[PDB]
């Protein structure tokens, strides 16, 4: 509870870097064939917002680990020439820069 307000601010800033909403909600296999076979631990902004409010993050370090999970997942499933991989890599770097001390 001393980080909940901080985490809410971090997640609104990071979601503003994905205006199309590519990482807004869980990926399904009907729209991304094989996802569930390739990605073992799915993550997305909706899920992270849920976990904030549910107090499931005990540190900023655990929140940053879920953001890196979401971007790493995207960089594995999508090829480097795709819009998805390019956005994931971009916001990964930008968002860790913002979260750092």
Among 9, 31, 10, CA closest to 22:
31
Q: What tokens were used for 3?
A: 């980080």
State how far the Cα of 25 lies from the Cα of 6, in Å rounded to an integer: 21
Tell me how far apart the terminal alpha carbons of the chain are, to the nearest angstrom. 19
The answer to whether 72 and 38 are in contact (CB under 8 A) is no
Stated in angstroms to one decimal place, the resolution of this structure is 1.5
Residue 31, number of CB atoms within 10 A of its CB: 7
In the chain, what are the domains?
1-101 (1.20.920.10)
Radius of gyration of the chain (CA): 13
Among 71, 21, 19, CA closest to 42:
71
Q: What tokens were used for 86?
A: 């390019």
Q: What tokens were used for 82?
A: 């795709």
HEC string of 1-64?
Answer: CCCHHHHHHHHHHHHHCCCCCCCCCCCCCCCCCCHHHHCCCCCCHHHHHHHHHCCCCCCHHHHH
The answer to whether 57 and 51 are in contact (CB under 8 A) is yes
């Amino acid at each position: 509870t001393p980080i909940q307000q901080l985490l809410e601010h971090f997640l609104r800033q990071l979601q503003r870097k994905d205006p199309h909403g590519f990482f807004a909600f869980p990926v399904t296999d009907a729209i991304a064939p094989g996802y569930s076979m390739i990605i073992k631990h799915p993550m997305d902004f909706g899920t992270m917002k849920d976990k904030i409010v549910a107090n499931e993050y005990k540190s900023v370090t655990e929140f940053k680990a879920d953001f890196k999970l979401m971007c790493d997942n995207a960089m594995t499933y999508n090829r480097p020439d795709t819009v998805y991989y390019k956005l994931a890599k971009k916001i990964l770097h930008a968002g860790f820069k913002m979260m750092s001390k």
